[PDB]
């Protein structure tokens, strides 16, 4: 809750100032962080899915929800109901603590990190990025690997616009560019 305290003391004062909001509830806030791993190769075997949920459970200390196909498509050889991915929703303190370990540890552990994009905010403040490789998290041991995965992070916030989320993450010194 270190970053939640930093939000509550300095980010709110900053954004109320730089936007001239009438109310403090008018301020943006982060709501949830969603961690998907779309695993389309688990149709070969469940153990690949079973290991991706084990890896992502080490990243965020939650058991992941194994997602399935909403419908059936033949280009990917799937039927409605096949387990095809895994997700984790992070809220509250576990959200903040992951967001701390992210922007403090893992983003520096990216090979050839040179910034993010500010053009990934889906028109309505919610930011989405995707990592190529799970070893940037230090939870994962490098020898203890099975397969180089990749996942994607989706930060869902209460910002109406795109810039209010851009200012919120910049208030958390989020490495755009």
């Amino acid at each position: 809750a270190k970053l939640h305290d930093y939000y509550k003391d300095e980010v709110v004062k900053k954004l109320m100032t730089e936007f001239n909001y009438n109310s403090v509830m008018q301020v943006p806030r982060v709501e949830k962080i969603t961690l998907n791993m779309g695993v389309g190769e688990a149709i070969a075997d469940k153990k690949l899915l079973d290991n991706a949920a084990a890896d992502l459970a080490a990243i965020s200390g939650q058991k992941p929800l194994i997602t399935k196909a909403r419908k059936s498509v033949a280009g990917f050889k799937i039927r409605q109901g096949y387990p095809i991915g895994c997700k984790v929703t992070l809220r509250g303190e576990r959200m903040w603590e992951f967001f701390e370990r992210l922007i403090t540890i893992a983003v520096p552990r990216i090979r050839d990190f040179r910034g993010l994009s500010a053009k990934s905010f889906d028109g309505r403040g919610n930011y989405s990025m995707g990592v190529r490789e799970q070893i940037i998290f230090p939870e994962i041991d490098y020898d203890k690997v099975d397969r180089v995965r990749g996942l994607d992070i989706t930060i869902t916030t209460t910002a109406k616009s795109d810039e209010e989320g851009r200012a919120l993450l910049a208030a958390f010194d989020f490495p755009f560019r």
């Binding site: 459970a57 200390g61 939650q62 040179r114 230090p138 010194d173 490495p175």
Partner: protein, 66 residues
């Protein structure tokens, strides 16, 4: 949260090469020694230097004199 199903999520200490110390909750268990943190990452100076286009006329005039 449920009781048993989630992994152990415990506060540990992570120290770095820049001498940063940060206590986080993690699933590692043991203490952690890092390599780069957000404090010591060369994103704000080094990546700025790391463009390095260089001039073609300046290489030319550098290689000799008329």
């Amino acid at each position: 949260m449920k009781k048993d199903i989630h992994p152990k999520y415990e506060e540990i200490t992570a120290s770095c090469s820049c001498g940063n110390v940060m206590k986080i909750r993690s699933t590692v268990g043991h203490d952690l020694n890092l390599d780069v943190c957000s404090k010591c990452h060369p994103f704000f100076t080094g990546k700025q230097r790391d463009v390095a286009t260089g001039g073609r006329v300046d290489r030319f005039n550098k290689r000799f004199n008329i």
